[PDB]
């Protein structure tokens, strides 16, 4: 489903606030993912030793990864749907090396929404959350199509 410019602007105006401190947002989002759906942590050989939220919060390398994740996602969002070039390497690594099912991409989308909702009520009212959800649905739909092309049933 194609987003309107108005919807993209709601997405980008909350992303602008994420970008005040991407590192802290990335910690919150990865931690929320791992707490809400612990099976997702097991996909990270790099991080699955972390036992508690405290350990997660103290991990500089998890923080680093959260910045990488959110910056990659931000670049995708800023393309406003024209994200074919960005999705290719992402889909290929996530299909073939990391083996991340679409269901787990749903889980991180949920975590993103939850953190934005908590942190940014001024820029994440119902319409803005709907726009973000549409953007993440488009991301997951297009990633799923690439997964199929790449041979992964996701
Ligand atoms: C918004 C969705 C996501 C984005 C934008 C994202 C982005 C990235 C980026 C940019 C990398 C580093 C380059 C690469 O290997 O592609 C990465 C690595 C990785 N991703 Fe994701 N990712 C997302 C969701 C997920 C989810 C939900 C999982 C697991 C449940 C996952 C598992 C991994 C793993 C295991 C790595 C390798 C980490 C390491 O050992 O360095 N990703 N991701």
CA distance 2 to 81: 8
DSSP reduced 3-state for 116: helix
Q: Token digits for 139?
A: 């991301």
Task: Name the DSSP class of 120.
Answer: -
Cα–Cα distances in angstroms (integers) from residue 90 to residues 65, 85, 94, 127, 150, in the given order: 14, 9, 6, 28, 12
Residue nearest (by alpha carbon) to ligand 1 atom 4: 69
Domain boundaries, position 118: 1-154
CA distance 150 to 95: 7
CA distance 31 to 153: 27
Q: Provide the CATH number for the domain around residue 145.
A: 1.10.490.10
Distance of CA 1 to the CA centre of its chain: 18
Residue of 25, 43, 70, 98 best suited for mutating to test ligand 1, as the one with most atoms within 8 Å of CB: 98
Q: How many domains does the chain have?
A: 1
Spell out which residues line ligand 1, taking CB within 6 angstroms. Answer: 40, 43-44, 46, 68-69, 72-73, 90, 93-94, 98, 100, 104-105, 108
Which one, of 43, 40, 62, 44, lies nearest residue 53 by Cα?
62
């Amino acid at each position: 489903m194609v987003l309107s410019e108005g919807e993209w602007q709601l997405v980008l105006h909350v992303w602008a606030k994420v970008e005040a401190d991407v590192a802290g947002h990335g910690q919150d989002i990865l931690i929320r993912l791992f707490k809400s759906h612990p099976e997702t942590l097991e996909k990270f050989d790099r991080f699955k030793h972390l036992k508690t939220e405290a350990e997660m919060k103290a991990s500089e390398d998890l923080k680093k990864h959260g910045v990488t994740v959110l910056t990659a996602l931000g670049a995708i969002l800023k393309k406003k749907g024209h994200h074919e070039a960005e999705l290719k390497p992402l889909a290929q690594s996530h299909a073939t090396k990391h083996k991340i099912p679409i269901k787990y991409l749903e889980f991180i989308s949920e975590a993103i929404i939850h953190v934005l909702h908590s942190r940014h009520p001024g820029d994440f009212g119902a319409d803005a959350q709907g726009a973000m959800n549409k953007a993440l649905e488009l991301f997951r739909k297009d990633i799923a199509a690439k997964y199929k092309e790449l041979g992964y049933q996701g």
